[PDB]
Amino acid sequence: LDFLRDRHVRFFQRCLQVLPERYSSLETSRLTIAFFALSGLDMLDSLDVVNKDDIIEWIYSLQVLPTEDRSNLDRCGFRGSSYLGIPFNPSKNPGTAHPYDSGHIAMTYTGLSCLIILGDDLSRVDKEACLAGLRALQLEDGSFCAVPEGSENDMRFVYCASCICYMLNNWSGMDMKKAISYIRRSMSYDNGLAQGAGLESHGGSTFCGIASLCLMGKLEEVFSEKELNRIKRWCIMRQQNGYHGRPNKPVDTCYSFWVGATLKLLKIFQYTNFEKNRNYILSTQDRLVGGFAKWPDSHPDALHAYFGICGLSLMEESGICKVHPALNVSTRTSERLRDLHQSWKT
Amino acid sequence: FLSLDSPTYVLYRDRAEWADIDPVPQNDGPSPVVQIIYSEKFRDVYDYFRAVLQRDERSERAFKLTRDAIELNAANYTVWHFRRVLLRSLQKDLQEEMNYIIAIIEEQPKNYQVWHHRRVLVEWLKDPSQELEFIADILNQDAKNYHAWQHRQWVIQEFRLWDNELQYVDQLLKEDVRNNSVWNQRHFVISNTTGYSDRAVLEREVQYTLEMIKLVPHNESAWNYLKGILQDRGLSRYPNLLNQLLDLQPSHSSPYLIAFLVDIYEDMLENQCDNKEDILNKALELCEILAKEKDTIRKEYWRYIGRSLQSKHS
Numbered sequence A: 001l002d003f004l005r006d007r008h009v010r011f012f013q014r015c016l017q018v019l020p021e022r023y024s025s026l027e028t029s030r031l032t033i034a035f036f037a038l039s040g041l042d043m044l045d046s047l048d049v050v051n052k053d054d055i056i057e058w059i060y061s062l063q064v065l066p067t068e069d070r071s072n073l074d075r076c077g078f079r080g081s082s083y084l085g086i087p088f089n090p091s092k093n094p095g096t097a098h099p100y101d102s103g104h105i106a107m108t109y110t111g112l113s114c115l116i117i118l119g120d121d122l123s124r125v126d127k128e129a130c131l132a133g134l135r136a137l138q139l140e141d142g143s144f145c146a147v148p149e150g151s152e153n154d155m156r157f158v159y160c161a162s163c164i165c166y167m168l169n170n171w172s173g174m175d176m177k178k179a180i181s182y183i184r185r186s187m188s189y190d191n192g193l194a195q196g197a198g199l200e201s202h203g204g205s206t207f208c209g210i211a212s213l214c215l216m217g218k219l220e221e222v223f224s225e226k227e228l229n230r231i232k233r234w235c236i237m238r239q240q241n242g243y244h245g246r247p248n249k250p251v252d253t254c255y256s257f258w259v260g261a262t263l264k265l266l267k268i269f270q271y272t273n274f275e276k277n278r279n280y281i282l283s284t285q286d287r288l289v290g291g292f293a294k295w296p297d298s299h300p301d302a303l304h305a306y307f308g309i310c311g312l313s314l315m316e317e318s319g320i321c322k323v324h325p326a327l328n329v330s331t332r333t334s335e336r337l338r339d340l341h342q343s344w345k346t
Numbered sequence B: 001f002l003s004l005d006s007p008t009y010v011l012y013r014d015r016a017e018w019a020d021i022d023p024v025p026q027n028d029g030p031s032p033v034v035q036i037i038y039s040e041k042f043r044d045v046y047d048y049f050r051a052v053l054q055r056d057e058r059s060e061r062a063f064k065l066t067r068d069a070i071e072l073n074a075a076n077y078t079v080w081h082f083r084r085v086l087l088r089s090l091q092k093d094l095q096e097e098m099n100y101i102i103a104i105i106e107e108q109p110k111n112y113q114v115w116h117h118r119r120v121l122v123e124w125l126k127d128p129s130q131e132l133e134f135i136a137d138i139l140n141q142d143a144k145n146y147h148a149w150q151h152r153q154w155v156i157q158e159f160r161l162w163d164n165e166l167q168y169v170d171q172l173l174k175e176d177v178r179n180n181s182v183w184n185q186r187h188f189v190i191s192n193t194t195g196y197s198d199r200a201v202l203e204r205e206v207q208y209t210l211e212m213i214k215l216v217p218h219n220e221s222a223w224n225y226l227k228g229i230l231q232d233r234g235l236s237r238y239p240n241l242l243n244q245l246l247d248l249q250p251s252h253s254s255p256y257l258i259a260f261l262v263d264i265y266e267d268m269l270e271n272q273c274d275n276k277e278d279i280l281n282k283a284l285e286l287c288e289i290l291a292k293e294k295d296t297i298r299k300e301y302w303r304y305i306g307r308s309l310q311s312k313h314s
């Protein structure tokens, strides 16, 4: 029907407030929920309804800073929350040593991302420590893990690594040649990109691969024109009305961004059917509580609310800022990031 | 031991065996963001979990505490890591842990942490004997579970268990020829065993796919496989294919077939074929058929492809 803008603003506001225990599984990734909410409000031009200062302090309390003896550099970055019980410290004093305290790549990414959205200048971010932490996460095959203690490794984290290097405007955080190699090896026989070599190509991993290359400014250099044409074909074939993540799977609102953003980066989103996509996204809108679900008449969540809005943004919805398809923040935010980078180079 | 919903469950703060430990609370500071409220029981388990973690206590009681922490929140990766540290320190029976994780995964098949945990265990035991059957069970409740297929490919590759996968793939394609995950598996098996350079294999596969396409002509997965195993060899290098497809157009038509033809014609133009201007027109005619009536949702795309062909071959 129509875009329930006000309701979504309230939805995101509630996400930043207090949640029922039924959401406990989000504990270690509260920072990404904050990101969906803040970046979502930013996208709707309503960051004024939140106290940017309080939130900035909270985010900084999540940074894993190097200890006095700097013997934990390989573990720096940001935590998803304070579940470890480390005493509140908004990146003021040094780092309180702890056997199992370290950053999580997706949190370092959404964390830095949130700081920029809120207006902070990243002066309290130990840039070198984060980059050291990032380097430690990369594997021999070029992909990344999420934490130094070990985890699964795939395209999702390659994207996080790329975003971090881009935001800190320093690529010493990764061995770019090896990352590119990983991205190439993930291309499937059907031409989409998978999470890793041999796996089923997917809309999410294709976005991560393509966006990473664009952030590195090496899209053209890595894939030939023929290859890019094949990838474009695979991506545009994902539209049914809304978009699905892989052949023969039902559509899900978030793919309007995962795939749509990829198509935008490949410069052919303009050739997709806007109306059917918009109609589908809006049909997953929760008219009562706000936010978007993956399917109509389904429960909404922060992730699908944010990506649904970004999907709408791709077609320039009346009332929604333009989204930077590769960085996943508002263009307004990417512009502010540009200034920040300029100001540092002095 | 003592279940979280047992009538006789006792908070850790009331257990004698935990008297010496001072619980460590979580503090989100002055103004918390995205704060989750916890029940007494929940906060109690984690207040002691933090205590044990902070002191890196490699004890048996800590090991049992992780079982409760996991029941409360299986997505906490730190808990799983610590449990692995304890499994080693206490030299626990890993065969028993396999039973544990096997049950956990069945209840939460989409959780990244539980699949990672199982993979570490299998690496430790160097025993993949249970894997293929376990995965087949999970795939039985969700034949497209990305985590299951990923784990299956890892096991097969790591312990070279290729012997029966192609047969497993054939079985699943009969159950649902539209499962894109299975078609991917098929290419995974073949390209990692015989490869496709063996003309006898390529022929067997192309023939197999055409048979599947005839059964269900509107199936992107089957068409993607067919084009996938031939595109790098050169679609135009297979004259009988072009005609066999043109013979399907009458009845077994679909946008996938039309698209395939356009791609064949494009390969021809790319290799300075005979009747360049005639071929180009055959392609353009199809692009417009796709845009105007066969794949209308991609109307603007196909027309864009058309314009691309003209400006490149004229």
Ligand SMILES: N#Cc1ccc(Cn2cncc2CN2CCN(c3cccc(Cl)c3)C(=O)C2)cc1
Pocket (backbone or CB within 6 Å): A106, A155, A156, A157, A159, A160, A203, A204, A205, A208, A245, A252, A254, A258, A294, A303
């Ligand atoms: N990529 C991808 C992907 C994987 C699975 C899905 C399936 N899916 C559909 N609706 C929700 C989901 C689950 N996703 C959200 C994206 N994501 C992610 C993406 C990028 C970075 C990071 Cl840290 C995390 C995940 O780990 C899990 C969708 C997209």
Ligand SMILES: [Zn+2]
Pocket (backbone or CB within 6 Å): A252, A253, A254, A255, A294, A304
């Ligand atoms: Zn989704």
